[PDB]
């Protein structure tokens, strides 16, 4: 009866007889057969492929997120949120560790601060490097900074995503959206990646 596998008193017959769309199916399933007949003989090969195809959206790896009205310049000391002013310590390390990922010249006054759930990163076996590539491959209109992947408990992993000015140049002719509205729309896109 649990969500996603609801096969309780008549639901599935109602999904068939009423011709309910896929969006209204509470017990939809699907069977996939491996392309290589040799691979389907081995359980471990089928086990890792099964875990390969499992929707892990970027939202479920997040414990909490903060939307900040900040711009980042390497030299100029811009204003920063007092509760997150300690983030600058690992920002300097990121700048000296990536001589090719320099901050752009069109960074907007909008910052998204992310605190990754390290427990979910362990159970789902998701590395920090994999998350960075996935977000940078899907969102070219953002600049992303991250802390160091730490193996010591008590120190979190921080993802910082800076919105570029082109994020609003996408569609700002529709003036019925203040810059706060687009930024909230962007973070919804980032979390659902």
């Amino acid at each position: 009866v649990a969500g996603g596998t609801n096969k309780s008193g008549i639901v599935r017959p109602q999904e068939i007889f009423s011709a309910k769309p896929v969006e209204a199916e509470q017990s939809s399933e699907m069977l996939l057969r491996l392309k290589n007949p040799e691979v389907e003989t081995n359980k471990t090969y089928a086990q890792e492929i099964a875990n390969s195809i499992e929707l892990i959206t970027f939202e479920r790896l997040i414990l909490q997120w903060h939307l900040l009205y900040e711009t980042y310049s390497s030299t100029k000391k811009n204003v920063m949120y007092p509760d997150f002013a300690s983030d600058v310590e690992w920002m300097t390390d990121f700048l000296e560790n990536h001589p090719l990922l320099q901050p752009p010249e069109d960074i907007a006054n909008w910052c998204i601060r992310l605190e990754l759930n390290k427990t979910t990163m362990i159970l789902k076996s998701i590395s920090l490097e994999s998350i960075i590539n996935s977000l940078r491959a899907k969102h070219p209109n953002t600049y992303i900074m991250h802390s160091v992947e730490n193996t010591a408990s008590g120190i979190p992993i921080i993802i910082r995503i800076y919105l570029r000015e082109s994020a609003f140049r996408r569609s700002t002719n529709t003036r019925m959206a203040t810059d706060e509205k687009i930024a909230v729309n962007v973070v919804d896109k980032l979390l659902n990646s």
Partner: protein, 78 residues
């Protein structure tokens, strides 16, 4: 006494190899070619067998043990 000691050892090995069945210590999931992972030294015929070739079970486990220990402690907190 022998039964409980052997059960402790076997259960510890089973838990370790069930955690690192698809999970790879080097991050992500296992990349298996030639029956062996490329990121680590895991073999296919060791995940579900710890008796036929004990030495190869006592090496892989000896490689990522404390690692495994830190992750186990981290999950059981907060």
């Amino acid at each position: 006494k022998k039964v409980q000691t052997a059960l402790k050892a076997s259960l510890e090995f089973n838990t370790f190899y069930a955690f690192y069945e698809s999970r790879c210590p080097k991050g992500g999931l296992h990349d298996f070619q030639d029956k062996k992972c490329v990121k680590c030294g895991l073999f296919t015929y060791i995940i579900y067998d710890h008796l036929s070739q004990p030495e190869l079970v006592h090496d892989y486990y000896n490689n990522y043990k404390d690692q495994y220990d830190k992750e186990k402690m981290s999950i059981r907190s907060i």
